[PDB]
Write a protein that binds this ligand. Structure first.
Ligand SMILES: CCC1(C)CCCCC1
Ligand SMILES: CCC1(C)CCCCC1
Ligand SMILES: [Zn+2]
Ligand SMILES: [Zn+2]
Ligand SMILES: [Zn+2]
Ligand SMILES: [Zn+2]
Ligand SMILES: [Zn+2]
Ligand SMILES: [Zn+2]
Ligand SMILES: [Zn+2]
Ligand SMILES: [Zn+2]
Lengths: 331, 331
């Protein structure tokens, strides 16, 4: 807890600056970018789009993103390093497993999984020597038996290293409650855990029950909305029909309840996206042309106009991410 | 149909020699070997075990294997090339999709998939320039909607290039019938298709219905048996309780019915195996210490002793694979 691992090495806590805690360079599948780069036009075109996007984000004040792409999201840490160097934006990489693990992962024990997460945190990802600074896990409703092993192994890895855990939920099923019970049964401190996609729900009794016990709350999909996309079912099912304003007002709600130190904010944006319908990226880019700059350009001014102070917003976008990311057992 | 693509380039039909048509260097998942080589001891240990295994196979008469590992079996063509060069055994690589495609594949159209298979056949796998010489597909019972797209795209790729298709079935559900109907609805010639795992069933009415219409029959798992593995459920569910002799006698049955030109024989062996329970490889290696040499060392003498001629066996192990692998629309 003097240093956070990024794809270009250790940085100090003050270097992190304004940090987006849930993003993706590319939302894909393991091996997919190497096997089928033309899906994205080309590898070089994906690089360029990401570099330009991160440069716009940097010009709006962003200094670091946490790329929460796992193995099964097709995380390519060389791609991340390349993009990070060209855009002059720090990128923290992730270990863990999301919702699409292949058989070679799904057949593993809790102990085996813990070894895998530990490898990626303590030694390096693949042969790159790049180390993950965060562990990403997932459920979508009631955990499957394998997802329970994942959550346990994430807890064990976090307990050995101090690196935080961040989660994918189906927020309407209140999955944070089950995630929390499993993490706690392994002895993990809630202050090392972000329950993500929590802006997908308006249930304050769920959000406050998590925050009351010490969890960080990931209000991480603020520009996800299909409002005013006429007759696009696939975009609707992915993005929802709640407005970005509704999502953003959750940030204010939690501040008003005393939880300003526990809120993490992000876009959950990407520059490529192969794990859904073809051309989702173009649909998403039309909905939110600011991409990752959407938080500083649109959300911050919206909240200031609703009465949230500049100091409070800086605490949420700079202090909370540094405190979350800094390795420790108890933050 | 003067040349077959291998992981070290084109070879002529007579160079193929005695060919095992359904094998694996490593049965894994995309990205898995690169991310977690220690699962296999090490990458170098996997290489060594495979080299020694293929050397024993070569000393028993094998000259070529067809590695039917796809993308989602974690096919690593550089690993295959390395092993092939050190063992002096030709390896044909595969494209297609088996039973574990990730989301980035499962969301694709028939046209998109056809482009992907065509890439791997006509251009190269990843950035290696190595081209697949066969297309591998799979069902396990009634095809899912995505598996139907896979089978169609395999047919389309085969129709453009002449490269054959080979299949995984759940033979007890007679999946070959549905596979055949889909391939035929795309216009594919049965003489370009091997219906694999066909030695998993004793149903002659199923096997002959496929052979009668021109399909090749993959009797490809001959040493798979859990007989005399006391109380090992996982090995039993994978390997079955029919003896290798029972499987091998299917070769004789089809010869006796007039189908000697349509039989392809293999072990469906591997040197690493991460997509099942931990230590399956050790269990499998104790059941069949000859590995890929099991066909020439054990099956061939068994069939000669039951009255099959040497010439017939050479036609099955040399001529049928050359005729199957040689690119053409109608073999
Ligand atoms: C103490 C919380 C506060 C009044 C500070 C400024 C941001 C909005 C709420
Ligand atoms: C014509 C088929 C045959 C009598 C030849 C030798 C192998 C066994 C059957
Ligand atoms: Zn998610
Ligand atoms: Zn507690
Ligand atoms: Zn939603
Ligand atoms: Zn995400
Ligand atoms: Zn199979
Ligand atoms: Zn026909
Ligand atoms: Zn069986
Ligand atoms: Zn196989």
């Amino acid at each position: 807890g003097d240093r956070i691992n990024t794809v270009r090495g250790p940085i100090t806590i003050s270097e992190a600056g304004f940090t987006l805690t849930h993003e993706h360079i590319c939302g894909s599948s393991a091996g997919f970018l190497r096997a089928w780069p033309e899906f994205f036009g080309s590898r070089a075109a994906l690089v360029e789009k990401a570099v330009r996007g991160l440069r716009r984000a940097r010009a709006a004040g962003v200094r670091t993103i946490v790329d929460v792409s796992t193995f099964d999201i097709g995380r390519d840490v060389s791609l991340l390093a390349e993009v990070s160097r060209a855009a002059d934006v720090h990128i923290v990489a992730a270990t863990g497993l999301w919702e699409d693990p292949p058989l070679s992962m799904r057949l593993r024990s809790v102990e085996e999984l813990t070894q895998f997460f530990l490898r990626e945190i303590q030694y390096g990802i693949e042969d790159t020597g790049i180390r993950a600074g965060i562990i990403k896990v997932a459920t979508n409703g009631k955990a499957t038996p394998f997802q329970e092993l994942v959550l346990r192994a994430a807890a064990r890895a976090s307990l050995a290293t101090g690196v935080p855990v961040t989660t994918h939920t189906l927020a309407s099923q209140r999955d944070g409650e089950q995630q929390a019970a499993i993490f706690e049964s392994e002895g993990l401190s809630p202050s090392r855990v972000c329950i993500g996609h929590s802006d997908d729900t308006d249930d304050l009794s769920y959000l406050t029950a998590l925050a009351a016990r010490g969890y960080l709350i990931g209000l991480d999909g603020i520009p996800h909305s299909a409002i005013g996309l006429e007759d696009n079912a696939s975009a609707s099912a992915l993005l929802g029909n709640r407005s970005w304003q509704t999502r953003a007002l959750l940030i204010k709600a939690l501040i008003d309840q005393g939880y300003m130190k526990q809120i993490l904010v992000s876009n959950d944006w990407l520059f490529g996206f192969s794990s859904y319908v073809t051309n989702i990226m173009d649909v998403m880019d039309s909905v939110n042309p600011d991409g990752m700059a959407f938080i500083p350009l649109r959300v911050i001014p919206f909240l200031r106009e609703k009465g949230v102070s500049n100091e409070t917003l800086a605490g949420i976008t700079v202090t909370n991410p540094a405190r979350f990311l800094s390795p420790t057992l108890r933050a």
